[PDB]
């Protein structure tokens, strides 16, 4: 009786970009832009911190493999100094955090490899991947797994509700950080899964 | 495998005779972790604290005896949930290496059943962070369900590169109390880093 919890835009699929290595940097449909230290204008460009979503394809010149799912990945690039702050990716769900529940967040994490003409990918800047009930982050993977140059790996996040818990009833919510803890400081993140489960 | 040298990791300093017994001040070696100062600095029984406890031959909040030794950590919040969080913290005499792979394991306590009247069922969610300088490497932020009166360890990892912007920065540990519900205390034992080259 394992439950999957709609994510919208999970795989960040939309939208479709045709030429390997193209990217947007506006918000990915489905999910806001996570911005506490104001680190992203709300006008991006491609010299700005910026978000979007990026094709990952055959002849992909940062990385060492496809898209964990489909096509695109979802990344976010910071240009300030590590240490300024975070930014990510929200979205806040439509289903709500139910009592005596097991939940299972699943978020692939990647890491750009290469040089283009001066500019350096390698380095890492971190990761946190929450789960959230209301404005409460209930369960959170900060920066757990080694993430090596080019490749992608599966953090997962889980949290088990009471009968009792405070938060229950609230709208659930999913957030992918980048912590901005060193150069490069981009990074990339692929099919988001949240499943629920009775205990 | 290289251990790293943590004061006091198991709580057992000081040594408590009664069974239940405890104390309300930082354990020694430790530093009191207050980002929102909810733990004053003189302490009593119903106020914020923390400190260590005796859980000996028939505790009666756990299933249960410490997962190590005599004593647990235990960190007590008094206020609200949501306003804030607070525990244990200390930097230690090793410094962040290259091509390393660190590995923090703490086990985290669930206070369980009843005492004069008061009822321990519930748990407040907890963090546990290994640093370098005050960069939080790596963090479990409240991933394991711990059942009422049992244990459960947590493993937090971090991997150097060569280039590590925190190389040789002094490594540090905390161990938080999230006062995200009630019952709001909660505990940890058996403290343990260790290096590994890549
Ligand atoms: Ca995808
Ligand atoms: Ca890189
Ligand atoms: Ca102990
Ligand atoms: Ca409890």
């Given at each position: 009786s394992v439950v999957s919890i709609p994510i919208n835009n999970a795989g960040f699929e939309d939208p479709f970009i045709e030429v390997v290595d193209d990217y947007t940097?506006?918000?990915?449909?489905?999910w806001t832009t996570y911005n506490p230290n104001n680190l992203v204008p709300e006008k991006r460009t491609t010299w700005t911190s910026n978000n979007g979503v990026g094709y990952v394809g055959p002849?992909?010149?940062?990385?060492?493999?496809?898209?964990?799912?489909?096509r695109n990945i979802g990344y976010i690039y910071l240009a300030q100094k590590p240490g300024s702050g975070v930014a990510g990716f929200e979205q806040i769900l439509d289903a709500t955090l139910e009592p005596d529940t097991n939940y299972t967040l699943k978020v692939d994490v990647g890491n750009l490899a290469g040089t283009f003409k001066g500019l350096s990918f390698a380095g890492f800047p971190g990761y946190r991947v929450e789960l959230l009930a209301g404005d409460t982050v209930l369960a959170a993977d900060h920066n757990n797994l080694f993430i090596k140059e080019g490749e992608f790996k599966t953090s997962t996040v889980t949290y088990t509700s009471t009968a009792?818990?405070?938060?229950?009833g609230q709208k659930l919510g999913i957030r992918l950080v980048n912590?901005?803890?060193?150069?490069?400081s981009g990074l990339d993140f692929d099919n988001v899964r949240l499943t629920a489960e009775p205990t």
């Open positions: 940097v506006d918000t990915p449909p489905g002849g992909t010149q940062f990385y060492n493999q496809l898209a964990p799912e489909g009792k818990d405070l938060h229950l912590l901005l803890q060193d150069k490069f």
